[PDB]
Amino acid sequence: NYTFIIAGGGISGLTLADRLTEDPRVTVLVIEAGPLDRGEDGILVPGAFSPWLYFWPGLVSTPQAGLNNRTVDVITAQVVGGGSTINAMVYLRGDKDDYDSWGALGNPGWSWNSMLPYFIKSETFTPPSPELAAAGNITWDGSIRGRSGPVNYSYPNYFFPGSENWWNAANEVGLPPVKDPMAGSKQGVFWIPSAIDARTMTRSHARRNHYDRVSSRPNYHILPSHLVSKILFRGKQAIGVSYIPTSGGNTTTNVYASKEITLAAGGLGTPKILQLSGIGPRKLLNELGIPVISDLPGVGQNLQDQPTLTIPYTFTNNVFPNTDSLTTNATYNAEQRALYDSSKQGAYTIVNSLSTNIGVMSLQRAAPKSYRQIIAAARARSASLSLPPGTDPAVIRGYQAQRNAILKQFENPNVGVGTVHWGTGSSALVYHLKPLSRGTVNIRSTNPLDAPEIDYRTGTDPIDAQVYTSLFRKNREIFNAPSMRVLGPSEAAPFGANLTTDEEIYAVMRELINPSNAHQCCTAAMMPKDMGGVVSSEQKVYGVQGLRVADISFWPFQLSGSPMATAYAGAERLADVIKKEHRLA
Ligand SMILES: Cc1cc2c(cc1C)N(C[C@H](O)[C@H](O)[C@H](O)COP(=O)(O)OP(=O)(O)OC[C@H]1O[C@@H](n3cnc4c(N)ncnc43)[C@H](O)[C@@H]1O)c1[nH]c(=O)[nH]c(=O)c1N2
Ligand SMILES: *[C@@H]1O[C@H](CO)[C@@H](O[C@@H]2O[C@H](CO)[C@@H](O)[C@H](O)[C@H]2NC(C)=O)[C@H](O)[C@H]1NC(C)=O
Ligand SMILES: C[C@H](NC(=O)CCC(=O)c1cccs1)c1cccnc1
Ligand SMILES: *[C@@H]1O[C@H](CO)[C@@H](O)[C@H](O)[C@H]1NC(C)=O
Ligand SMILES: *[C@@H]1O[C@H](CO)[C@@H](O)[C@H](O)[C@H]1NC(C)=O
Ligand SMILES: *[C@@H]1O[C@H](CO)[C@@H](O)[C@H](O)[C@H]1NC(C)=O
Ligand SMILES: *[C@@H]1O[C@H](CO)[C@@H](O)[C@H](O)[C@H]1NC(C)=O
Ligand SMILES: [Mg+2]
Ligand code: NA
């Protein structure tokens, strides 16, 4: 018997478990699918980055109707610390209107204003050295970055010289320096804040900052290498869970909570727990002979990710050193590793293949001459066309409300819809941050070891291709600007300067886009039940008591940026909500 059981030991699960166990009268069990990492160089050292160590095995998509029916390997964490243990350590808040929009969907107490103190509470920013800030153009607003919270973040202590050419090129094509991308807008270029502890130049993942930090606590229990297979009920009250070994041994165990069950199993895990437990669409549950506890057609609907594109380049005059010097120059690689091992300086403080700066842009910044044409197309098309016919009408209503919020974001000069990056080597990256497409994640069986059916439905909403084509063209502007032309870049096949029309460009993008940056969200959405929502504004699952969703399954839609910073802050916020209801310390 525990006070709380948390299903999943990732960013949201560990943050919540940490905060709840600050009260010695409160016991928590975190049940986590994956093992404890072993402090491998691939995890702790940015330059050694090896995310594949703890990928969840045997997840593959359905054929992707929007991407030439390609099937893709699905990437999500299976490890204590979840995504934080194996992600690229990119630490960015969303824009103000992301959180304001979540509130306006019918979620009282959700706004930029209510989130800011939880962003601050979550973290400790360590400033870079003054010479690197000056040379690098590293800026921040100390007033809105935390100084006392457990997540350490800072910057690498080095930049590849080519990052200078790219910064100036970006400035030449209307991506100006951003004072602080953590201040609720990020229109232009800025240094990437990195979830690194500057004392050791090592990863500050949730395993460290929300478990190891507090693991002397006898009330903070962890069970790695087990799966929560089902929620247990007395009537509509969630009272416990069944768990099994992740390795598939024919064993099942029941464990009980006096106060609540929290789901923290992520975008691809939480909906499976709900559906196996009879919380989900009665059509699916009836087909599988699962007794319905709560008929919620939103469970496993509204899947979102942030598609990526990798654009290959050749250079006649690239500057040495660059990120690819680490792979192609054994001498450079040895000297940089020796340097890191001695004085913790140099290229090994940067996540392997990344550079130090990045660019985010609104729709009107990407497409200043045409953004109103894209908005008109999106406005003209019924929200229902983005979903299969027969989609539950509550789910269509919630999608329409999300869509109307995103079209306002499209009109907003201060909300990002795309990211541009150049690692300093043979490729650039373009990320689509705000897809209008929605996918699904549904169980195929009652067997808790069976992968769910994962259908991203990337590029099914035709507006996504118009936005993404505009983002591609802006990246092309950066590479053609005078500061980059000195390095002699040219797009390589299957891209190329000879692809000049939207149709020629998008035909190649349809074959190369990745549905996912492992940013899966929004499959147990926080919206009103009559809008196809799964959880209330307090993250309580509709139709049952003592059951909440903490992981980014609860998000209505994707941010202007990567999810990690908000996964921490959203868990900080929920810890206080739970403490308030249950009168905890
Ligand atoms: C390789 C890679 C790279 C990136 C990213 C992810 C990944 C995998 N992301 C995304 C980001 O890390 C991710 O969105 C967050 O970790 C989500 O936090 P959650 O708490 O929702 O899930 P998270 O995935 O952290 O945790 C869920 C946990 O539940 C466990 N689990 C699932 N089913 C279970 C069950 N039935 N029982 C028990 N446990 C169960 C899983 O094992 C996992 O540890 C990212 N973001 C960003 O901002 N910056 C970045 O650089 C990156 N890069
Ligand atoms: C990571 O952030 C934590 C939390 O603010 C920092 O921990 C503090 O460290 C100082 C100096 O070691 C101590 O005097 C404080 O008592 C610590 N506070 C807590 C709550 O732990 C740590 O310094 C940060 N890392 C870096 C590089 O600054
Ligand atoms: C899925 C995973 N994604 C990341 O590492 C995030 C990467 C990320 O945010 C950024 C990279 C550059 C600027 S920002 C992954 C793993 C392996 C290969 N490809 C992708
Ligand atoms: C994808 O497969 C479907 C069959 O389900 C087919 O109708 C369609 O033409 C295919 N698309 C492409 C681009 O081949
Ligand atoms: C920093 O910005 C200045 C312009 O203010 C520019 O001259 C310089 O090249 C930039 N350096 C880097 C590394 O971005
Ligand atoms: C698991 O054990 C139970 C009880 O012995 C048994 O009924 C069932 O056949 C077993 N399942 C498998 C796959 O071994
Ligand atoms: C390889 O890296 C070393 C170490 O910095 C450098 O001296 C050398 O010029 C590099 N070789 C090439 C071919 O770039
Ligand atoms: Mg200093
Ligand atoms: Na409820």
Author numbering: 46 to 630
What is written in the article reporting this PDB entry?
The FAD-dependent oxidoreductase from Chaetomium thermophilum (CtFDO) is a novel thermostable glycoprotein from the glucose–methanol–choline (GMC) oxidoreductase superfamily.
PESB is further stabilized by vdW interactions with FAD, Ala133, Val135, Leu399, His466, Leu474, Tyr476 and Asn562. Subsite S2 of CtFDO was found to bind only aromatic moieties (the thiophene moiety of PESB). Different moieties of the bound compounds use the individual subsites differently. Ser607 in the ‘in’ conformation participates in binding the active-site water molecule (CtFDO:free and CtFDO:PESB), formic acid in the S1 subsite (CtFDO:MAMB, CtFDO:PESB and CtFDO:IPEA) and in the catalytic site (CtFDO:4NP).
